[PDB]
C-alpha cells in the first residue's frame, strides 16, 4: 500500500486570467479548488515496468500500462493555485511566499506575453522560485502549428534570463491531454528541497477558520484553526505558540498590536492527522483559541512561532531596493518611476501585505513607516513592492528587509 504522508512539497500555479490554472490543478489531482486562493494534493508514483511518461500515475494502480503490480510511490505533492486577475497581484505574491517550485499556465489560444503572464514571471524571479515548468495550456482549441509559433515566442521570451532553458509543455487541462508529460517534468524539473529542520520553526498563515456549524453549543465549540505552510522547521501537537503581530487592540480608538499565545491541539493535512507538521504542503493547525479570533481569515498574514521565539515585530522597517525598468503588469508600456518620500507603497512580505508611508529615499534604500505592524523573522527578507497606478496596485520592485 502507499503510505498516508503530508505533502512534501509546494508546487504554485501562476499565470493570466482564464489561462486555464485551476483547471490545470483539476486535470492533476481530481480536485477542484473553489478558493481565491486554492489548494490540492496528490500522491505521485511510478510504475517501474512501464515506459514513461504514461508510467507516472496519481493514484495506486499500474493497469493502464498493463501491469497488476502497484507502483512506486515516490512523494506526495500540493498546489498552491493563485488567481490571475491583475486586481489579485497581492494573493498571487502571498502566494508565493509559501511555493518550492511553480508553474506557468500560458493559454495557447491568446496571444503571449499577457501582462499577468509577465507580473507573476518576474514577481517568481524576484521571490526566488526558479524550479518553474512552463505549461502551455489549451493546446486542444488550436494546431500543432500555432501552438509551436507561440513555443517560439516563448523561448524568445526567456532567453536570456534565469528561464532561459525552463521547459515547455503542451497539455489539454480541461479535456486531459498530456498530463502524464506534465507530472514526468514534476518529478524532473520540481524536486523536493532540502528542509533543515534544526532551524526555529516558521509558518506563514494564509487561512483561519471557525470550523463549528450552526447550532453547535459552547460547550462543544471547536478551538480556532489556523492555516499556512511551514517554511521553516516542523511544529508538533501540544506545542506552545504564538501568532505574530497578533491581535490588534482598540484603546480609547489607538491601536496596537499584541501577540497571540495558544498551543497546538491539533495537526492536519487536508483529511489526514499528523503528530507534527513539516514544510511543504498547507498544515491546518487547531487551537485553543476562541473561534471568534480566527473567523474568516482574520489571521491572514500572520506568522506562527513556538511562544519563547523572538521575533522583531516591526511598525517601520528599511528596505535594500531594487526597482524594475517598466511596469510589467501595466495593459500599456509604463516605465517605473523613482521612489518619492511621501509615498504610500505597498509591502509583500511572507504572506502579509501592508501599506506604508515612505520616510526616507537613498539610492539602495527607503525608510517606511507601515500602517500595520509586520513580524520579521529572519535577517534576510525579501519584500516584493508595489505602488497604485492608475487605481490598480502594480509590482514595481523589490527589497531585503534589513534587521
Ligand atoms: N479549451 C480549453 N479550455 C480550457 C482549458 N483549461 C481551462 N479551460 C477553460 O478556461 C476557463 C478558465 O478556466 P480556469 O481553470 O478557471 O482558469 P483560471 O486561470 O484558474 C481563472 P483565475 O485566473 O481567475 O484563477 C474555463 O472555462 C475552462 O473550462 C483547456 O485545456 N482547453
Ligand atoms: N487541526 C484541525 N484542523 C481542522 C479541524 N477541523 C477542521 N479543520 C480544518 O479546518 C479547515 C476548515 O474546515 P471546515 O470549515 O470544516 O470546512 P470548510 O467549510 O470547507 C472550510 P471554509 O470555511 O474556508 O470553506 C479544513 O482545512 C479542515 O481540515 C480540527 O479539529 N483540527
Ligand atoms: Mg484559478
Ligand atoms: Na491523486
Ligand atoms: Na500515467
Ligand atoms: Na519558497
Ligand atoms: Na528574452
Ligand atoms: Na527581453
Ligand atoms: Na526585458
Ligand atoms: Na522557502
Ligand atoms: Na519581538
Ligand atoms: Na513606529
Known amino acids: 500500500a502507499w503510505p498516508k504522508v503530508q505533502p512534501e512539497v509546494n508546487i504554485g500555479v501562476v499565470g493570466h486570467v482564464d489561462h486555464g490554472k485551476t483547471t ?53 505533492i500540493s498546489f498552491i493555485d493563485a488567481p490571475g486577475h491583475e486586481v489579485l497581484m497581492a494573493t498571487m505574491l502571498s ?69 532561459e532553458n525552463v521547459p515547455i509543455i503542451p497539455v489539454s487541462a480541461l479535456h486531459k491531454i498530456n498530463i502524464d508529460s506534465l507530472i514526468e517534468g514534476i518529478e524532473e524539473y520540481i524536486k523536493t528541497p532540502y528542509r533543515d529542520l534544526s532551524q526555529k520553526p516558521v509558518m506563514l498563515v494564509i487561512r483561519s477558520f471557525d470550523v463549528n456549524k450552526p447550532g453547535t453549543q459552547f460547550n462543544e465549540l471547536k478551538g480556532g484553526v489556523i492555516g499556512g ?19 490588534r487592540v482598540e484603546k480609547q480608538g489607538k491601536v496596537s498590536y499584541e501577540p497571540i499565545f495558544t498551543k497546538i491541539s491539533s495537526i492536519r493535512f487536508g483529511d489526514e492527522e499528523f503528530k507534527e507538521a513539516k514544510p511543504g ?19 491572514l498574514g500572520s506568522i506562527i512561532t513556538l511562544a519563547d521565539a523572538e ?34 507603497l505597498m509591502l509583500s512580505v511572507g504572506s502579509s ?12 534604500e527607503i525608510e517606511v513607516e507601515l500602517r500595520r ?31
Request: hydrophobic share 40%; aromatic share 6%.
Open 24 to 76: 490545470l490543478v483539476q486535470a492533476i489531482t481530481g480536485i477542484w479548488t473553489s478558493k481565491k486562493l486554492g489548494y490540492a494534493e496528490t500522491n505521485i508514483g511510478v510504475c517501474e515496468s512501464c515506459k514513461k511518461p504514461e508510467a507516472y500515475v496519481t493514484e495506486p494502480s499500474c493497469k493502464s500500462c498493463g501491469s497488476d503490480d502497484e507502483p512506486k510511490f515516490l512523494r506526495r
Open 95 to 163: 502566494g508565493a511566499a509559501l511555493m518550492d517550485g511553480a508553474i506557468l499556465v500560458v493559454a495557447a489560444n491568446e496571444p503571449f506575453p499577457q501582462p499577468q503572464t509577465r507580473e507573476h514571471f518576474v514577481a517568481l524571479g524576484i521571490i526566488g522560485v526558479k524550479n518553474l515548468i512552463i505549461v502551455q495550456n489549451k493546446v486542444d482549441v488550436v494546431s500543432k502549428e500555432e501552438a509551436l509559433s507561440q513555443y517560439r515566442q516563448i523561448k524568445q521570451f526567456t532567453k536570456g534570463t534565469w528561464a
Open 229 to 247: 505552510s511551514i517554511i521553516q522547521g516542523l511544529f508538533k501537537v501540544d506545542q506552545e505558540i504564538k501568532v505574530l503581530p497578533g491581535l
Open 281 to 299: 504542503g498547507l498544515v491546518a493547525i487547531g487551537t485553543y483559541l476562541d473561534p471568534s479570533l480566527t473567523k474568516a481569515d482574520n489571521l
Open 311 to 344: 521575533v522583531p515585530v516591526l511598525w517601520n522597517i528599511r528596505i535594500k531596493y531594487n526597482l524594475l525598468e517598466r511596469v510589467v503588469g501595466a495593459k500599456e508600456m509604463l516605465k517605473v518611476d523613482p521612489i518619492r518620500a511621501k509615498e504610500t
Open 353 to 364: 501585505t501592508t501599506l506604508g508611508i515612505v520616510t526616507s529615499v537613498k539610492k539602495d
Open 373 to 403: 505592524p509586520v513580524a520579521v523573522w529572519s535577517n534576510n527578507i525579501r519584500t516584493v513592492i508595489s505602488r497604485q497606478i492608475a487605481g490598480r496596485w502594480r509590482m514595481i520592485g523589490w527589497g531585503l528587509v534589513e534587521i
